[PDB]
Design a protein around this ligand. Structure first.
Ligand SMILES: Nc1nc2c(ncn2[C@@H]2O[C@H](COP(=O)(O)CP(=O)(O)OP(=O)(O)O)[C@@H](O)[C@H]2O)c(=O)[nH]1
Ligand SMILES: Nc1nc2c(ncn2[C@@H]2O[C@H](COP(=O)(O)CP(=O)(O)OP(=O)(O)O)[C@@H](O)[C@H]2O)c(=O)[nH]1
Ligand SMILES: Nc1nc2c(ncn2[C@@H]2O[C@H](COP(=O)(O)CP(=O)(O)OP(=O)(O)O)[C@@H](O)[C@H]2O)c(=O)[nH]1
Ligand SMILES: [Mg+2]
Ligand SMILES: [Mg+2]
Ligand SMILES: [Mg+2]
Lengths: 337, 337, 337
């Protein structure tokens, strides 16, 4: 019987179905790259209020939101417009992510479409039962006050409809490469975004030297709250030891992590990668967190790495350690006795 | 014109469209029986969080709920899981009962899928405009405290989204057959459930010796509140007189009925059944209720009955006469002056 | 690519998509006329609780609402029934107006289907993002108190889910034609309704001597609040001057308009119509409103007019100038110092 056969097949499902949704200009640009470079077992959805930007984007599925409100002509940097446009097209957004076990929402906060629509996409995602994760950036300071204030209000709004919320503050990118021009600024930020999003997705979906169980992934991210990342990599031969230390000292991981529970670790490298190096990585990280933190990790081989091991660290539950101001994220300053 | 022809046809509709929805293990088992034995003009919908149980079930329509939450692997006796799973699949549940004039929701309360999903199915049913009736059982006491507390909380939740709520307390079954083994326990309870559900459905949908008008059915059940049943039957020749007295004295009808408004009576028997016997039944019952109670009744002939008349009594509006405790239903004890 | 081609085509869209929805007897009758006489670029949707009335109606789309509640047998003058019936069929109502840039909701308030369902249709319309305008009538006084009280409560309910709400009080029709019989009463009211609805639609959708931009239409009506109309026309040769004065003195425009912002003006006439006459019309009206009022206007040629110019005035934002009583609309009486 068709129904019964359908029920049996479901039980044989082997991999988690993942969907990546990019909103606004920056988000569509991230999506275009993932589609071209490829992103192991994950469909791509692009959404915009701006028709031209959507046309030049490459993705499995495109949705023009706010057709009646904006008219395919952008949201002009206004968050409230991006939000009403998304609410207006909620039905189409929902049908595009309906069968997903997990949904990644990515965009650069600061403008009108991404900042306004991301929280709406996340709310629809949770309503349908998918693990809902966001990977977004805060704007550079040179972009100015209005852009940051809008980004911060959007981060707040997004926190409420998200399982784990991963924030990358673009301004820290200058601490990685001090004298960089705005030209290459958004090029570096692009790189970081792809590594974070692709690193998390592959950790969950790419066959490695140890199996990572989606049910564990879900248990840790279900209450990931606010999260931050760290990226490091070594070319030497004492690789692991150096990549992890670099990742842990990354300016991107701008928060006190000793009180963290949960964390996801993805160690990448060449054919000669060993569970031994991965383990050294995990334990070095494992000691800086809470003694009872849950850690999810994996290890994958990447041809293009040639002779390097890259380490991606996502540390969760740090919201209590951060302060959300109109001007950005500031490491919290706890009150004396 | 296709539209106009469609509108005319609707006016020619003759019978109420009924749907029976069974949730969880016990509910699916009840559905499997109804489908095989047949149930005059009513489609069958089975829903479960457990794939295996759904596979071995027989029904017109099957829905695996909570696919992302539980993974076709049951709800493990947790009501909150059954509830989120149902909310997660609300769209599919709705489309399955969308065109129903009336919806019957049946399950055994106590576990996780039925207790949690029944109130959700009932809420969707009312939202679409269907007469919403539930026929459920409370667990035996030997099953223990946790199972009863969960059943009671579910009954409460279900009361709020239901037109009339029919409760069968399995523990009373021992007063019918005193020394019975757990083996046959759930076999007796199965029998009772089928007679209640099939008795109500046929009363509404089976051609009898008097026509029962769906609009009257709807008027009485629209405010049936909490309801209880009674079953009796006579083999003698003073049949009617005995079946009704047995039904009225049934341990299943564990409440003071003198203050009841509304009631549904279904008298069943062989080819020799007469409107005379039905009427004696009705009047004997009619005198124990409120002097202004509304009674809906019918009379049908059943080949398999050979030489017996069976009487099904459903007495509504008794909630004020019952006390809902964590440990079960207790006849209420009104406060003195 | 199909998606991309689809996105490009959207950018080439030239006209606003308009839908007219008539509810109840009077509304269906208005719809039947619009469909036959034709109504430049606007689809017609008819909805009723009464099957017979829906059958004899002519429209692009018909929807029988409340199929489970009422059974194609009307709502018997009860607003609460009309409302539950509409809520019950919300999904079908929504799909019928889903792709509309603008939605006009018309009916005669006073009975059960129109009064109850109009606010529901308007709420669905706003939810999807369409400009939501209502054009409705208040009953004659000879119809009695109950009919007016129900009409007034419906107007109140409708105000909350509408962008601009246009009210035509049928009782004023006697000031236009003093000694008129009930026979011709509803015939005159029919005429007025068609001119108001068709006048507004054509102003937005009919090619004229000056282009009216939908975006301006939307900006003015977005906050039109309560609106009233005025109709005038001249056969002479000092046409414009007379039509506008007649329109401005119309008993239909029963409110103090000096404090009005926004207004829509549609001047119609024969082949010899000139932007000069239209302009005289606009300026004569423009001086009675607030010095900063926004006015939207157009001018169209109608063959059937032969030698007359007709003027349609819709003046918005007058709610503060009106008093909503159980017995009707009364020009407000501001409180002294
Ligand atoms: N990594 C990148 N970040 C970018 C890029 N362009 C902008 N951004 C970041 O995102 C912010 C603005 O993003 P978008 O241009 O995508 C704004 P959006 O399209 O969502 O709003 P509207 O233009 O109003 O439609 C800006 O403040 C930057 O911090 C880019 O090419 N790469
Ligand atoms: N009449 C019957 N009642 C049953 C039967 N099995 C269980 N029950 C009653 O229902 C209660 C448990 O029912 P189910 O096994 O259907 C619980 P459910 O499937 O809804 O929850 P999960 O296992 O967590 O998925 C139990 O407390 C009993 O009182 C049966 O075969 N027949
Ligand atoms: N312009 C017209 N107005 C009408 C006409 N018939 C009624 N009406 C007005 O509308 C009011 C009643 O309208 P309907 O007959 O359409 C009431 P409806 O169908 O919505 O309610 P139910 O009969 O309960 O289904 C009445 O109080 C009148 O003021 C008509 O032919 N033309
Ligand atoms: Mg943009
Ligand atoms: Mg089970
Ligand atoms: Mg009618």
């Amino acid at each position: 019987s068709p129904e019964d056969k359908e029920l049996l097949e479901y039980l044989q499902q082997t991999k988690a179905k993942i969907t990546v949704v990019g909103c606004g200009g920056a988000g569509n640009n991230t999506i275009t790259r993932l589609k071209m470079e490829g992103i192991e077992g994950a469909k791509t959805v692009a959404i915009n209020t701006d028709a031209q930007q959507l046309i030049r984007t490459k993705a499995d599925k495109k949705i023009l939101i706010g057709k009646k409100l904006t008219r395919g002509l952008g949201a002009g940097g206004n968050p409230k417009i991006g939000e009403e446009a998304a609410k207006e097209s909620a039905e189409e957004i929902k049908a595009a992510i309906q069968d997903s076990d997990m949904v990644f929402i990515t965009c650069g906060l600061g403008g009108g479409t991404g900042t306004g629509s991301a929280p709406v996409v996340a709310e629809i995602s949770k309503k349908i039962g998918a693990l809902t994760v966001a990977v977004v950036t805060l704007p550079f300071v040179m972009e100015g006050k209005v852009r940051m204030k809008n980004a911060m209000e959007g981060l707040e709004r997004l926190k409420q409809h998200t399982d784990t919320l991963v924030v990358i503050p673009n301004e820290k990118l200058f601490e990685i490469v001090p004298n960089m021009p705005l030209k290459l600024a958004f090029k570096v930020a692009d790189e970081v975004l792809i590594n974070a999003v692709k690193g998390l997705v592959e950790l969950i979906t790419k066959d490695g030297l140890i199996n990572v169980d989606f049910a564990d992934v879900k248990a840790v991210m279900n209450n990931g709250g606010l999260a931050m990342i760290g990226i490091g990599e070594s070319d030497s031969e004492k690789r692991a030891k150096e990549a992890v230390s670099m990742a842990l000292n990354s300016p991107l991981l701008d928060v006190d992590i000793d009180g963290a529970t949960g964390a996801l670790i993805h160690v990448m490298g060449p054919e000669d990668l060993t569970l031994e190096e991965a383990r050294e990585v995990v334990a070095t990280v494992s000691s800086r967190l809470d003694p009872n933190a849950t850690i999810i990790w994996g290890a994958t081989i990447d041809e293009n790495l040639e002779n390097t091991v890259r380490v991606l660290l996502v540390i969760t539950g740090v919201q209590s350690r951060i302060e959300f101001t109109d001007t950005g994220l500031k490491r919290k300053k706890l009150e004396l006795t």
